Amino acid sequence: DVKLVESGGGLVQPGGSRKLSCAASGFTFSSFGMHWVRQAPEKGLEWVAYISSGSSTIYYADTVKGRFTISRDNPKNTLFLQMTSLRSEDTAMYYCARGDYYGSRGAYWGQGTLVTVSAAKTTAPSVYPLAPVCGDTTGSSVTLGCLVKGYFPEPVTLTWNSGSLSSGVHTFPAVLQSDLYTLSSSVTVTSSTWPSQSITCNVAHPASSTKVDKKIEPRG
Amino acid sequence: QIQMTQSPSSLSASLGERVSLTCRASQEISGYLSWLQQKPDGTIKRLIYAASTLDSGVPKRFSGSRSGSDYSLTISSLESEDFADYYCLQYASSPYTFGGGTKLEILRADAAPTVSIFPPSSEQLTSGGASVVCFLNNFYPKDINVKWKIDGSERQNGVLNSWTDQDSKDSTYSMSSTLTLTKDEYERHNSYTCEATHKTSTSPIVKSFNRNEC
Numbered sequence A: 001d002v003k004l005v006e007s008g009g010g011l012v013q014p015g016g017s018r019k020l021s022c023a024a025s026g027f028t029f030s031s032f033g034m035h036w037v038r039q040a041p042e043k044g045l046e047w048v049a050y051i052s053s054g055s056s057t058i059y060y061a062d063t064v065k066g067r068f069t070i071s072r073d074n075p076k077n078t079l080f081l082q083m084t085s086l087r088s089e090d091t092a093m094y095y096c097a098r099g100d101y102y103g104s105r106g107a108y109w110g111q112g113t114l115v116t117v118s119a120a121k122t123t124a125p126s127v128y129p130l131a132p133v134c135g136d137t138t139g140s141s142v143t144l145g146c147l148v149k150g151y152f153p154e155p156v157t158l159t160w161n162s163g164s165l166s167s168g169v170h171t172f173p174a175v176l177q178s179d180l181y182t183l184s185s186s187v188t189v190t191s192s193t194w195p196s197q198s199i200t201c202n203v204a205h206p207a208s209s210t211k212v213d214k215k216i217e218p219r220g
Numbered sequence B: 001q002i003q004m005t006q007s008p009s010s011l012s013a014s015l016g017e018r019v020s021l022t023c024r025a026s027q028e029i030s031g032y033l034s035w036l037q038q039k040p041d042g043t044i045k046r047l048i049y050a051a052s053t054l055d056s057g058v059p060k061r062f063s064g065s066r067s068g069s070d071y072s073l074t075i076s077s078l079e080s081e082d083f084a085d086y087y088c089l090q091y092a093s094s095p096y097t098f099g100g101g102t103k104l105e106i107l108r109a110d111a112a113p114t115v116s117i118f119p120p121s122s123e124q125l126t127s128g129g130a131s132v133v134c135f136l137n138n139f140y141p142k143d144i145n146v147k148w149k150i151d152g153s154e155r156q157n158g159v160l161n162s163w164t165d166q167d168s169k170d171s172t173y174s175m176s177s178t179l180t181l182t183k184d185e186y187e188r189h190n191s192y193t194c195e196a197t198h199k200t201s202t203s204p205i206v207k208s209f210n211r212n213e214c
């Protein structure tokens, strides 16, 4: 079955440039015109470029005219978007989508890749175990939490017991304060479970090669 | 640009209830309207195209229609899978414009939060900082007020809130209040209250620890 796979996201300093790839499979690439659609952190979808099957009709969003270059290598089933003069606004999730709705029948979007254009820098996070000591929640229930603060950029992977514990957990979305992110995840287990068992926060900030684990031990 | 004014911008409805999102295009598109559906996991899937042709797979309870320059998607009898974000797409003229969005949330029956206050971790303290995280779980509606109170006083400078999306199973929201302070100031006060006000009850669901010996 059809499947597009974007890939070229990263942290890019303003003014810099990045070149994304969108691999396609399950369809005669060479017959359809592709598109690139972006979506800003918490906003809508926004069309960006469109290249006809032959690469002989290209269109561009007013917002990207001139800075971006769209292209494809038909024999390698890959679409591309070369970016230039990456502003802050350029920050978003870059999905690739097959087009030519005119007759085509099927319609297929990608997963999206993320490109964050900041001046910031990378910054590994600190993981603080949130041992109850007052995590009330009912008494018959004992909630624990985990604090991941001071990282950049997104995303990070938090998990309760290397995956194992995956029920009763509420991971809250990240928030940018100053020029850093903070995220936390709560998780609930029955009184008995903790501390008879060991629940652990495993955080991994990909973009900075950071992987950590926190034994949520009682005390404070 | 051909503006696609989409509405409403969000709406809650109970299951089985019908809904009609609408897109008004500012120019003739001759029905080159399409309706996309973005699921919370990010995933995008087309539902209707050619302004009324359902895609292969899309349940026959979805139906596009057009009258004038007003295009409408009607979901009759809303089931769970329908909880998502919809976008209208007009592919008639070059600068391709999308509608604004509709965030369709599930109308659940009321549910008060489950506040649980957590004092600073000993590892953070030695870092110099001190954060008093305070989770408020499984409530509904989303509307929830949280006041932080270091000792007698209510404080603001330092709060870092972050709500969750409507949960997949219980359809309830969840929050995270995080007051940060320098170890210094934290250890120069004694009580800390995370008091939340929610439509479920009338009396502030208070949760407060306090430092001192142990």
Ligand SMILES: CP(=O)(O)Oc1ccc([N+](=O)[O-])cc1
Residues within 6 Å of the ligand: A033, A035, A036, A037, A047, A050, A097, A098, A099, A100, A101, A102, B089, B091, B096
């Ligand atoms: C006639 P054509 O398929 O190119 O119209 C489309 C253009 C853009 C698009 N998009 O998702 O960005 C989808 C369809």
Ligand SMILES: [Zn+2]
Residues within 6 Å of the ligand: B079, B080, B081
């Ligand atoms: Zn269904």
